[PDB]
GROMACS .gro file of C-alpha atoms in nm:
model
  321
    1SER     CA    1  -2.938   0.577   1.274
    2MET     CA    2  -2.852   0.918   1.115
    3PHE     CA    3  -2.713   1.243   1.249
    4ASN     CA    4  -2.890   1.556   1.123
    5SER     CA    5  -3.150   1.309   0.985
    6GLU     CA    6  -3.394   1.569   0.856
    7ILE     CA    7  -3.125   1.708   0.622
    8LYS     CA    8  -2.987   1.371   0.515
    9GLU     CA    9  -3.339   1.256   0.418
   10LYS     CA   10  -3.394   1.575   0.222
   11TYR     CA   11  -3.076   1.483   0.025
   12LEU     CA   12  -3.163   1.114  -0.004
   13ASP     CA   13  -3.503   1.217  -0.154
   14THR     CA   14  -3.316   1.361  -0.462
   15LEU     CA   15  -3.136   1.035  -0.544
   16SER     CA   16  -3.207   0.729  -0.753
   17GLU     CA   17  -3.297   0.416  -0.557
   18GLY     CA   18  -2.947   0.279  -0.642
   19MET     CA   19  -2.777   0.590  -0.504
   20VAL     CA   20  -2.993   0.577  -0.189
   21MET     CA   21  -2.866   0.222  -0.149
   22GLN     CA   22  -2.501   0.331  -0.145
   23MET     CA   23  -2.557   0.644   0.062
   24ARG     CA   24  -2.763   0.520   0.352
   25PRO     CA   25  -2.491   0.281   0.487
   26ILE     CA   26  -2.240   0.566   0.466
   27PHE     CA   27  -2.465   0.800   0.666
   28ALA     CA   28  -2.538   0.523   0.918
   29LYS     CA   29  -2.171   0.445   0.983
   30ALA     CA   30  -2.102   0.820   0.982
   31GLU     CA   31  -2.343   0.895   1.268
   32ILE     CA   32  -2.112   0.788   1.553
   33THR     CA   33  -1.842   1.031   1.427
   34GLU     CA   34  -2.091   1.310   1.351
   35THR     CA   35  -2.241   1.282   1.701
   36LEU     CA   36  -1.887   1.283   1.849
   37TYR     CA   37  -1.808   1.619   1.681
   38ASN     CA   38  -2.172   1.737   1.704
   39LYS     CA   39  -2.176   1.832   1.339
   40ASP     CA   40  -2.261   1.704   0.997
   41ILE     CA   41  -2.016   1.557   0.746
   42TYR     CA   42  -2.056   1.879   0.538
   43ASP     CA   43  -1.897   2.071   0.830
   44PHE     CA   44  -1.605   1.823   0.871
   45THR     CA   45  -1.249   1.940   0.823
   46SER     CA   46  -1.021   1.761   0.576
   47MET     CA   47  -0.871   1.571   0.866
   48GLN     CA   48  -1.218   1.475   0.989
   49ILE     CA   49  -1.318   1.350   0.640
   50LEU     CA   50  -1.006   1.128   0.641
   51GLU     CA   51  -1.090   1.006   0.992
   52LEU     CA   52  -1.452   0.948   0.891
   53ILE     CA   53  -1.354   0.727   0.598
   54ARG     CA   54  -1.094   0.549   0.810
   55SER     CA   55  -1.374   0.458   1.055
   56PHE     CA   56  -1.549   0.265   0.772
   57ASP     CA   57  -1.268  -0.002   0.781
   58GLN     CA   58  -1.223  -0.007   0.406
   59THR     CA   59  -0.938  -0.214   0.268
   60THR     CA   60  -0.853  -0.077  -0.077
   61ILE     CA   61  -0.764   0.257  -0.231
   62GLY     CA   62  -1.030   0.182  -0.496
   63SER     CA   63  -1.302   0.164  -0.232
   64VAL     CA   64  -1.174   0.465  -0.036
   65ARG     CA   65  -1.197   0.661  -0.361
   66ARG     CA   66  -1.553   0.551  -0.432
   67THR     CA   67  -1.648   0.652  -0.077
   68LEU     CA   68  -1.475   0.992  -0.106
   69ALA     CA   69  -1.653   1.062  -0.438
   70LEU     CA   70  -1.990   0.976  -0.283
   71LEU     CA   71  -1.926   1.205   0.015
   72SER     CA   72  -1.800   1.479  -0.220
   73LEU     CA   73  -2.135   1.470  -0.402
   74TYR     CA   74  -2.328   1.513  -0.079
   75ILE     CA   75  -2.103   1.799   0.031
   76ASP     CA   76  -2.158   1.984  -0.300
   77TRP     CA   77  -2.534   1.946  -0.252
   78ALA     CA   78  -2.496   2.076   0.104
   79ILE     CA   79  -2.294   2.380  -0.015
   80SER     CA   80  -2.551   2.461  -0.288
   81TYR     CA   81  -2.822   2.476  -0.012
   82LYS     CA   82  -2.596   2.704   0.209
   83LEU     CA   83  -2.611   2.439   0.487
   84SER     CA   84  -2.235   2.408   0.517
   85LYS     CA   85  -2.056   2.662   0.731
   86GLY     CA   86  -1.788   2.626   0.464
   87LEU     CA   87  -1.813   2.765   0.111
   88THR     CA   88  -1.572   2.507  -0.037
   89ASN     CA   89  -1.599   2.127  -0.060
   90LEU     CA   90  -1.314   2.002   0.165
   91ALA     CA   91  -1.337   1.645   0.021
   92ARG     CA   92  -1.204   1.790  -0.306
   93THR     CA   93  -0.887   1.923  -0.134
   94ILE     CA   94  -0.787   1.567  -0.040
   95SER     CA   95  -0.463   1.478  -0.219
   96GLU     CA   96  -0.377   1.142  -0.382
   97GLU     CA   97  -0.137   1.053  -0.094
   98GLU     CA   98  -0.408   1.144   0.160
   99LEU     CA   99  -0.633   0.873   0.014
  100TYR     CA  100  -0.392   0.632   0.181
  101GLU     CA  101  -0.470   0.790   0.512
  102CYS     CA  102  -0.840   0.695   0.459
  103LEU     CA  103  -0.741   0.325   0.461
  104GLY     CA  104  -0.881   0.124   0.753
  105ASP     CA  105  -0.654   0.034   1.042
  106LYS     CA  106  -0.717  -0.336   0.976
  107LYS     CA  107  -0.539  -0.296   0.640
  108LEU     CA  108  -0.222  -0.507   0.638
  109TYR     CA  109  -0.146  -0.582   0.278
  110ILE     CA  110  -0.118  -0.383  -0.039
  111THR     CA  111  -0.266  -0.502  -0.368
  112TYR     CA  112  -0.062  -0.506  -0.687
  113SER     CA  113  -0.260  -0.210  -0.812
  114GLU     CA  114  -0.182  -0.014  -0.489
  115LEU     CA  115   0.185  -0.106  -0.520
  116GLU     CA  116   0.183   0.041  -0.872
  117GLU     CA  117   0.002   0.357  -0.758
  118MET     CA  118   0.240   0.394  -0.465
  119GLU     CA  119   0.548   0.340  -0.684
  120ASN     CA  120   0.433   0.609  -0.922
  121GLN     CA  121   0.415   0.874  -0.647
  122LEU     CA  122   0.755   0.783  -0.502
  123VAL     CA  123   1.027   1.001  -0.652
  124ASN     CA  124   1.337   0.812  -0.518
  125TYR     CA  125   1.442   0.491  -0.688
  126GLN     CA  126   1.562   0.367  -0.343
  127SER     CA  127   1.196   0.395  -0.232
  128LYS     CA  128   1.055   0.234  -0.546
  129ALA     CA  129   1.315  -0.047  -0.536
  130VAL     CA  130   1.270  -0.150  -0.174
  131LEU     CA  131   0.891  -0.158  -0.200
  132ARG     CA  132   0.896  -0.349  -0.526
  133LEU     CA  133   1.181  -0.584  -0.449
  134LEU     CA  134   1.026  -0.683  -0.115
  135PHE     CA  135   0.688  -0.742  -0.281
  136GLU     CA  136   0.843  -0.972  -0.542
  137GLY     CA  137   1.037  -1.166  -0.281
  138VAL     CA  138   1.388  -1.048  -0.247
  139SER     CA  139   1.435  -1.040   0.120
  140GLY     CA  140   1.610  -1.304   0.323
  141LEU     CA  141   1.732  -1.300   0.681
  142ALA     CA  142   1.745  -0.943   0.809
  143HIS     CA  143   1.684  -0.844   0.441
  144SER     CA  144   2.024  -0.988   0.344
  145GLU     CA  145   1.912  -1.061  -0.019
  146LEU     CA  146   1.806  -0.703  -0.065
  147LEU     CA  147   2.105  -0.549   0.116
  148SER     CA  148   2.358  -0.761  -0.071
  149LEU     CA  149   2.192  -0.695  -0.412
  150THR     CA  150   2.427  -0.548  -0.671
  151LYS     CA  151   2.390  -0.381  -1.008
  152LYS     CA  152   2.562  -0.688  -1.158
  153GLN     CA  153   2.303  -0.933  -1.023
  154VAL     CA  154   2.031  -0.714  -1.172
  155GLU     CA  155   2.207  -0.699  -1.512
  156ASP     CA  156   2.265  -1.075  -1.514
  157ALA     CA  157   1.899  -1.136  -1.425
  158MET     CA  158   1.781  -0.939  -1.734
  159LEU     CA  159   1.992  -1.173  -1.950
  160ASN     CA  160   1.879  -1.489  -1.762
  161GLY     CA  161   1.499  -1.498  -1.803
  162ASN     CA  162   1.457  -1.244  -1.519
  163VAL     CA  163   1.593  -1.499  -1.264
  164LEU     CA  164   1.790  -1.312  -1.002
  165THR     CA  165   2.054  -1.504  -0.809
  166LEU     CA  166   2.013  -1.373  -0.455
  167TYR     CA  167   2.257  -1.401  -0.163
  168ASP     CA  168   2.138  -1.472   0.193
  169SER     CA  169   2.373  -1.417   0.490
  170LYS     CA  170   2.263  -1.740   0.652
  171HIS     CA  171   2.169  -1.991   0.378
  172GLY     CA  172   2.355  -1.849   0.075
  173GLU     CA  173   2.229  -1.860  -0.285
  174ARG     CA  174   1.870  -1.872  -0.403
  175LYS     CA  175   1.714  -1.814  -0.744
  176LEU     CA  176   1.403  -1.596  -0.782
  177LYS     CA  177   1.211  -1.494  -1.093
  178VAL     CA  178   1.107  -1.125  -1.096
  179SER     CA  179   0.928  -0.883  -1.326
  180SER     CA  180   1.121  -0.673  -1.574
  181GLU     CA  181   0.974  -0.362  -1.397
  182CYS     CA  182   1.146  -0.471  -1.072
  183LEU     CA  183   1.480  -0.518  -1.244
  184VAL     CA  184   1.474  -0.184  -1.423
  185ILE     CA  185   1.377  -0.013  -1.097
  186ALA     CA  186   1.664  -0.190  -0.916
  187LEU     CA  187   1.907  -0.101  -1.193
  188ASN     CA  188   1.821   0.268  -1.147
  189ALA     CA  189   1.831   0.242  -0.764
  190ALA     CA  190   2.188   0.102  -0.789
  191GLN     CA  191   2.308   0.417  -0.972
  192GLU     CA  192   2.118   0.678  -0.774
  193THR     CA  193   2.339   0.951  -0.630
  194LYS     CA  194   2.083   1.166  -0.447
  195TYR     CA  195   1.782   1.093  -0.227
  196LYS     CA  196   1.510   1.355  -0.203
  197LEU     CA  197   1.384   1.389   0.155
  198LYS     CA  198   1.010   1.368   0.239
  199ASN     CA  199   0.951   1.208  -0.101
  200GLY     CA  200   1.049   1.525  -0.287
  201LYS     CA  201   0.851   1.781  -0.085
  202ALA     CA  202   1.105   1.853   0.191
  203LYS     CA  203   1.015   2.191   0.346
  204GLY     CA  204   1.341   2.329   0.481
  205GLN     CA  205   1.698   2.387   0.375
  206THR     CA  206   1.836   2.041   0.289
  207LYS     CA  207   1.591   1.908   0.024
  208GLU     CA  208   1.821   1.625  -0.092
  209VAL     CA  209   2.106   1.420   0.056
  210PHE     CA  210   2.395   1.243  -0.112
  211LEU     CA  211   2.406   0.867  -0.130
  212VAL     CA  212   2.719   0.664  -0.089
  213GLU     CA  213   2.883   0.562  -0.416
  214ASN     CA  214   2.886   0.188  -0.477
  215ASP     CA  215   2.721  -0.082  -0.690
  216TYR     CA  216   2.456  -0.189  -0.428
  217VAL     CA  217   2.086  -0.128  -0.510
  218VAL     CA  218   2.029  -0.022  -0.149
  219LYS     CA  219   2.249   0.270  -0.050
  220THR     CA  220   2.346   0.431   0.282
  221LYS     CA  221   2.335   0.813   0.310
  222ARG     CA  222   2.683   0.976   0.309
  223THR     CA  223   2.594   1.158   0.636
  224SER     CA  224   2.555   0.820   0.817
  225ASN     CA  225   2.937   0.766   0.787
  226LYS     CA  226   2.886   0.386   0.769
  227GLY     CA  227   3.112   0.372   0.463
  228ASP     CA  228   3.086   0.242   0.110
  229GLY     CA  229   2.964  -0.114   0.168
  230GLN     CA  230   2.626  -0.285   0.205
  231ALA     CA  231   2.358  -0.089   0.389
  232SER     CA  232   2.234  -0.233   0.721
  233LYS     CA  233   1.879  -0.355   0.783
  234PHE     CA  234   1.796  -0.015   0.938
  235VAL     CA  235   1.824   0.150   0.595
  236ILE     CA  236   1.542  -0.076   0.468
  237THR     CA  237   1.330   0.023   0.768
  238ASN     CA  238   1.424   0.393   0.722
  239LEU     CA  239   1.313   0.379   0.357
  240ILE     CA  240   0.983   0.213   0.444
  241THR     CA  241   0.942   0.475   0.713
  242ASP     CA  242   0.982   0.752   0.450
  243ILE     CA  243   0.723   0.583   0.226
  244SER     CA  244   0.488   0.537   0.520
  245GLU     CA  245   0.535   0.901   0.630
  246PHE     CA  246   0.442   1.030   0.284
  247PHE     CA  247   0.127   0.818   0.261
  248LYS     CA  248   0.062   0.845   0.640
  249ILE     CA  249   0.000   0.477   0.684
  250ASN     CA  250   0.114   0.257   0.970
  251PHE     CA  251   0.073  -0.100   0.830
  252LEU     CA  252   0.377  -0.112   0.606
  253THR     CA  253   0.665  -0.334   0.718
  254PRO     CA  254   0.905  -0.556   0.526
  255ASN     CA  255   0.717  -0.873   0.626
  256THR     CA  256   0.384  -0.709   0.522
  257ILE     CA  257   0.515  -0.610   0.179
  258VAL     CA  258   0.658  -0.960   0.124
  259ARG     CA  259   0.324  -1.116   0.219
  260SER     CA  260   0.138  -0.878  -0.009
  261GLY     CA  261   0.325  -1.031  -0.304
  262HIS     CA  262   0.226  -1.380  -0.197
  263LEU     CA  263  -0.130  -1.250  -0.162
  264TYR     CA  264  -0.131  -1.109  -0.512
  265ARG     CA  265  -0.013  -1.442  -0.650
  266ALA     CA  266  -0.289  -1.608  -0.448
  267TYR     CA  267  -0.545  -1.378  -0.617
  268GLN     CA  268  -0.408  -1.467  -0.966
  269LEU     CA  269  -0.444  -1.841  -0.896
  270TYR     CA  270  -0.783  -1.790  -0.730
  271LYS     CA  271  -0.925  -1.603  -1.034
  272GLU     CA  272  -0.865  -1.909  -1.262
  273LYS     CA  273  -0.900  -2.183  -0.994
  274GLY     CA  274  -1.171  -2.061  -0.757
  275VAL     CA  275  -1.028  -2.203  -0.433
  276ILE     CA  276  -0.741  -2.116  -0.201
  277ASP     CA  277  -0.616  -2.424  -0.023
  278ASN     CA  278  -0.285  -2.593   0.060
  279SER     CA  279  -0.219  -2.671  -0.311
  280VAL     CA  280  -0.236  -2.294  -0.381
  281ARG     CA  281  -0.002  -2.236  -0.084
  282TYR     CA  282   0.250  -2.498  -0.203
  283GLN     CA  283   0.228  -2.338  -0.546
  284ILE     CA  284   0.309  -1.993  -0.395
  285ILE     CA  285   0.607  -2.143  -0.213
  286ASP     CA  286   0.725  -2.282  -0.548
  287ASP     CA  287   0.660  -1.968  -0.752
  288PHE     CA  288   0.855  -1.751  -0.506
  289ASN     CA  289   1.113  -2.029  -0.449
  290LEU     CA  290   1.042  -1.955  -0.086
  291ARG     CA  291   1.321  -2.008   0.164
  292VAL     CA  292   1.164  -2.242   0.427
  293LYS     CA  293   1.270  -2.496   0.692
  294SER     CA  294   1.000  -2.728   0.569
  295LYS     CA  295   0.737  -2.665   0.307
  296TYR     CA  296   0.450  -2.806   0.517
  297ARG     CA  297   0.532  -2.574   0.811
  298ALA     CA  298   0.539  -2.276   0.574
  299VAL     CA  299   0.208  -2.385   0.422
  300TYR     CA  300   0.062  -2.396   0.775
  301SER     CA  301   0.187  -2.039   0.855
  302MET     CA  302   0.035  -1.917   0.525
  303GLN     CA  303  -0.317  -2.010   0.642
  304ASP     CA  304  -0.302  -1.689   0.857
  305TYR     CA  305  -0.292  -1.476   0.533
  306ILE     CA  306  -0.319  -1.686   0.212
  307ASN     CA  307  -0.688  -1.773   0.239
  308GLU     CA  308  -1.018  -1.690   0.069
  309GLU     CA  309  -1.124  -1.428   0.326
  310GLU     CA  310  -0.810  -1.213   0.282
  311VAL     CA  311  -0.813  -1.253  -0.096
  312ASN     CA  312  -1.185  -1.161  -0.124
  313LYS     CA  313  -1.134  -0.856   0.099
  314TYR     CA  314  -0.825  -0.710  -0.075
  315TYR     CA  315  -0.907  -0.814  -0.433
  316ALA     CA  316  -1.290  -0.762  -0.438
  317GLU     CA  317  -1.289  -0.525  -0.736
  318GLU     CA  318  -1.061  -0.733  -0.963
  319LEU     CA  319  -1.261  -1.051  -0.884
  320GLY     CA  320  -1.591  -0.880  -0.991
  321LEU     CA  321  -1.771  -0.885  -0.652
   0.00000   0.00000   0.00000
């Protein structure tokens, strides 16, 4: 059950019963990875700590943090006994962005709180806007609502109870209520002239690139030579790629960010209501004014992600579980 058991038990013996309770499962799940490298956690590299935590299949940044702090404690104890080959605690060198890399590979959806933490670390308004706008529902066929979104629509929405009028390439107009944060973000994205590469830590020569000048919230790079009009769908995917590369996560797609917003709404309704059923799903369709062929078909598709299991998993902490 444990690797280097003698030493773990020596550490466990110093802990309160409640701390033993949290630590034992960590050491148990850790064994397979410790045996693979033939070394203890306290000898793991940074990269191995991130891999270790990833192997625990944890779903939220909140939980990843708690786990990292617990491991950090153990490592400090190990250093103080001179057991570690290393003199420094490598869990404490883990950056905020690198927490994201500890997320389990089953993770599909971001929570509202993770969206906000992600947004805050993203220096380009293009990045902030695409993440946020997708989460709140502006999408459409091949992201046509997002790609066609102008400064003017954003301005009008602020003066119209935050109801954006969105344009889809297929089905045309649709009204969607969004947060004031989303609108202000979009407003800034629409007037951005430069885009910092590698989320503002670009190593080499070209640290920033010029954006095309227009009134669209989503903007093509000048170097693409696609001209002054609407960006293509590939720009959306390129911007999510840049976000994903900074956080080093592989779950983030336009569909996944859209669904995350639905999932957050599901949590809000679940907190007051206590169930997630078709009535909750119909309500989510309504609240996002969701573009669907039929509502019942959409409600059926939503069973794959708008359900109690998914909500309990992603929103454990906020639900008090």
